[PDB]
Design an enzyme around this catalytic site. Structure first.
Site, PDB file in Angstrom:
ATOM      1  N   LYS A 103      -8.211  -0.992  -6.281  1.00  0.00           N
ATOM      2  CA  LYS A 103      -8.323  -0.185  -5.067  1.00  0.00           C
ATOM      3  C   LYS A 103      -9.741   0.407  -4.915  1.00  0.00           C
ATOM      4  CE  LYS A 103      -7.380   2.762  -1.662  1.00  0.00           C
ATOM      5  NZ  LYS A 103      -6.207   3.621  -1.766  1.00  0.00           N
TER       6      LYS A 103
ATOM      7  N   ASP B 101       2.002   3.494   3.249  1.00  0.00           N
ATOM      8  CA  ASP B 101       1.059   4.404   2.673  1.00  0.00           C
ATOM      9  C   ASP B 101       1.747   5.747   2.505  1.00  0.00           C
ATOM     10  OD1 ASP B 101      -2.236   5.801   3.382  1.00  0.00           O
ATOM     11  OD2 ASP B 101      -1.367   5.288   1.419  1.00  0.00           O
TER      12      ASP B 101
ATOM     13  N   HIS C 176       0.844  -1.164   0.000  1.00  0.00           N
ATOM     14  CA  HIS C 176       0.000   0.000   0.000  1.00  0.00           C
ATOM     15  C   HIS C 176       0.903   1.245   0.000  1.00  0.00           C
ATOM     16  CE1 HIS C 176      -3.990   2.249   0.761  1.00  0.00           C
ATOM     17  NE2 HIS C 176      -3.049   3.188   0.710  1.00  0.00           N
TER      18      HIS C 176
ATOM     19  N   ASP D 101      -5.370   1.712  11.962  1.00  0.00           N
ATOM     20  CA  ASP D 101      -5.857   3.006  12.396  1.00  0.00           C
ATOM     21  C   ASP D 101      -6.741   2.821  13.616  1.00  0.00           C
ATOM     22  OD1 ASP D 101      -6.469   5.311   9.479  1.00  0.00           O
ATOM     23  OD2 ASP D 101      -4.644   4.400  10.365  1.00  0.00           O
TER      24      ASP D 101
ATOM     25  N   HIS E  97       2.164   4.968  -2.752  1.00  0.00           N
ATOM     26  CA  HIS E  97       1.810   5.864  -3.870  1.00  0.00           C
ATOM     27  C   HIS E  97       3.044   6.613  -4.325  1.00  0.00           C
ATOM     28  CE1 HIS E  97      -2.392   5.761  -2.778  1.00  0.00           C
ATOM     29  NE2 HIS E  97      -1.955   5.811  -1.518  1.00  0.00           N
TER      30      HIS E  97
ATOM     31  N   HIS F 171      -0.299   1.991   7.840  1.00  0.00           N
ATOM     32  CA  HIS F 171      -0.185   3.380   8.246  1.00  0.00           C
ATOM     33  C   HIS F 171       0.839   3.552   9.381  1.00  0.00           C
ATOM     34  CE1 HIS F 171      -4.219   5.413   6.795  1.00  0.00           C
ATOM     35  NE2 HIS F 171      -3.222   5.601   5.933  1.00  0.00           N
TER      36      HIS F 171
ATOM     37  N   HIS G 244      -9.450   1.106   1.289  1.00  0.00           N
ATOM     38  CA  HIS G 244      -9.235   2.217   2.214  1.00  0.00           C
ATOM     39  C   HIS G 244     -10.455   2.099   3.147  1.00  0.00           C
ATOM     40  CE1 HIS G 244      -8.791   6.736   3.305  1.00  0.00           C
ATOM     41  NE2 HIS G 244      -9.883   6.314   3.941  1.00  0.00           N
TER      42      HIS G 244
ATOM     43  N   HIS H  99      -5.805   0.106   6.052  1.00  0.00           N
ATOM     44  CA  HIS H  99      -5.720   1.091   7.097  1.00  0.00           C
ATOM     45  C   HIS H  99      -6.232   0.540   8.412  1.00  0.00           C
ATOM     46  CE1 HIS H  99      -4.700   3.404   3.721  1.00  0.00           C
ATOM     47  NE2 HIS H  99      -5.881   3.968   3.436  1.00  0.00           N
TER      48      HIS H  99
HETATM   49 MN   LIG Z   1      -6.253   5.705   2.084  1.00  0.00          MN
HETATM   50 MN   LIG Z   2      -3.135   5.236   0.198  1.00  0.00          MN
END
Ligand SMILES: [Mn+2]
Ligand SMILES: [Mn+2]
Ligand SMILES: OCCc1ccccc1
Ligand SMILES: OCCc1ccccc1
Ligand SMILES: [Mn+2]
Ligand SMILES: [Mn+2]
Ligand code: NA
Ligand code: NA
Lengths: 331, 331
Positions: free
Chosen positions: B135, B267, B21, B199, B23, B220, B167, B196
């Site tokens: 995604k 992430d 995960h 979280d 970008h 994360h 997500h 995530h």
């Molecule tokens: Mn996200």
């Molecule tokens: Mn992301």
């Protein structure tokens, strides 16, 4: 201003000729056409459809069209350039933001947005050098906080470059008044602004009051009508139930009130339309087979028939757009 | 036997240590091409990414899964350019996140299914670069449109064997509703990564999903606003839980017996326009290790907490490979 920027470069004011001030090659979304061209059959198909349509408007006398598609309307400047060249019709591209800005745009400050509009007008769109010749903005009732920012930046960009601002309005709700207010608070001259979709309302008082203040009135939805499609909800919601004659009569109304110099007429037409229900293009095409040629083929003659003199018709279709498009800075 | 990357297919063995995960850039459709200067320049962004990717590579990272969808502004050409330059495998994604423009939001489940399939089967845009994952996302109870996306993603997964990653609003337990929708479509939980997940400290929530066969995305880890409690936007995005607290979730899941369902990542990104201005600088100050955080800090931490070498290797190499490997359901 002595030159208007087009997708093929700058043109002199004389070369603009008969211009349609509110049109679109394709009504979509940022990155949509490149990511999913088959939605429109193909890129090639869409372009061919566009060239056919532009050739026909051209046969009818249209020399220039202002494509008011913004970044968020999925404006694809390369497509505009290709069809402009293939059909031999001038196309003025736009900057600005419509009502579907993605997060990257929506979280921006007025200062930021100003620099982005400036980029598009002064340097060029994307990496093409194609410079915008108009700024498109919009509201759909009372402006959201972001839209007020958009309106302010638009005015700032217009003040710095001399290019005009054109808008999308929820006419029946008098959005033009709030728009004007914001524009004025930024010192923009009403003469650099066209309050669009004005034929969507039958409130002449609202329009003449705006014209009275020096705004340009865009009577750009003339051929939009669902009369004969009441059964089609989405089409009804999009086009309304007022006739093309009724809309066209507003042009005469404004002429009779003394504002012939403040009128801009167009069709708000397109060749592809992804930003709405699937199949809406077909429906539109059925409703108005003339497409962009509707103004010169049916509206001009209808007006002349109603008593509007040739010179007035000419002033509205040629002089008005030229004055509006000519980049003009505040003295 | 092969996983699609921006440089072509790779064998399951070539993936090695993978970050599932990440970008290259967090933006919006068409944003990078319309306003590259927002990131200094396209060239600046590429160089930054290459440096970061070279650094993670130095740390042991062989492949990264760039989960940027069309609406996150994925620019496959950029992905390919940086993959080549830093020599790190990059898997591209299809799907839709939570900022779809009108052209997407008005689509039917059937249309969206065909769009996801286009990107997986044929290629993204006109590049022929095929997506290796789908995604999707929700931020609390799914919206009507979001439900359609999840359904289309399941359909695309069932037809291509490519996994789905999401997500979630871990707090809200979004993962349960997601799983619900997926299962109603016949999707196997083993093809899904509930993202995530770190979280939330709710070990009940996480273990309940692991139990059903889902993959849990603890991506994360380095996100923490500790020490910036005074930066409202950052705290809002990063949270106030420490990286160690989040990391400890990994061990907990291991301890509860779900080591084969864990996927770990950062992430991270090199550009971020879809949030307040400067967030990138704030993030980089928080975690200068960037994508290398997992191998440089996370793995050693866990190891000191008693997590065994083979389990660490299992989570970082084994799991992603199994997850990424296109897998069609038995018939
Ligand atoms: Mn996200
Ligand atoms: Mn992301
Ligand atoms: O007197 C100029 C004639 C003209 C008519 C309508 C609008 C533009 C100009
Ligand atoms: O076979 C047990 C090794 C392994 C541990 C962690 C995740 C996947 C595999
Ligand atoms: Mn409009
Ligand atoms: Mn329009
Ligand atoms: Na310019
Ligand atoms: Na494929």
């Amino acid at each position: 201003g002595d030159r208007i920027n087009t997708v093929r470069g700058p043109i002199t004011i004389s070369e603009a000729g008969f211009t349609l001030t509110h049109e679109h090659i394709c009504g979509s979304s940022a990155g949509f056409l490149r990511a999913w061209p088959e939605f429109f059959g193909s890129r090639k198909a869409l372009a061919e459809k566009a060239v056919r349509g532009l050739r026909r408007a051209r046969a009818a006398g249209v020399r220039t069209i202002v494509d008011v598609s913004t970044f968020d309307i999925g404006r694809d400047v390369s497509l505009l350039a290709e069809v402009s060249r293939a059909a031999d019709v001038h196309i003025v591209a736009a900057t600005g933001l419509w009502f579907d800005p993605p997060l990257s745009m929506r979280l921006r400050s007025v200062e930021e947005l100003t620099q982005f509009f400036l980029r598009e007008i002064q340097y060029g769109i994307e990496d093409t050098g194609i410079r915008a010749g108009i700024i498109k903005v919009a509201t759909t009732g009372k402006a959201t906080p972001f839209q007020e920012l958009v309106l302010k930046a638009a005015a700032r960009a217009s003040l710095a470059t001399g290019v005009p601002v054109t808008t999308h309005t929820a006419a029946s709700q008098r959005d033009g008044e709030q728009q004007a207010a914001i524009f004025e608070s930024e010192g923009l001259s009403p003469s650099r602004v066209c309050i669009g979709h004005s034929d969507d309302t039958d409130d002449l008082s609202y329009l003449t009051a705006l014209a009275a203040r020096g705004y340009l009135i865009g009577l750009d939805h003339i051929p939009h009508s669902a009369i004969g499609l009441e059964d089609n909800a989405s089409a009804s919601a999009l086009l309304g139930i007022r006739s093309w004659q009724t809309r066209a009569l507003l042009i005469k109304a404004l002429i009779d009130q003394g504002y012939m110099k403040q009128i801009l007429v167009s069709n708000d037409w397109l060749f592809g339309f992804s930003s709405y229900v699937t199949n809406i293009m077909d429906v539109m095409d059925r409703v108005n087979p003339d497409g962009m040629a509707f103004i010169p083929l049916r509206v001009i003659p209808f007006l002349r028939e109603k008593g509007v003199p040739q010179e007035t018709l000419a002033g509205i279709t040629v002089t008005n757009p030229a004055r509006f498009l000519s980049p003009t800075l505040r003295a």
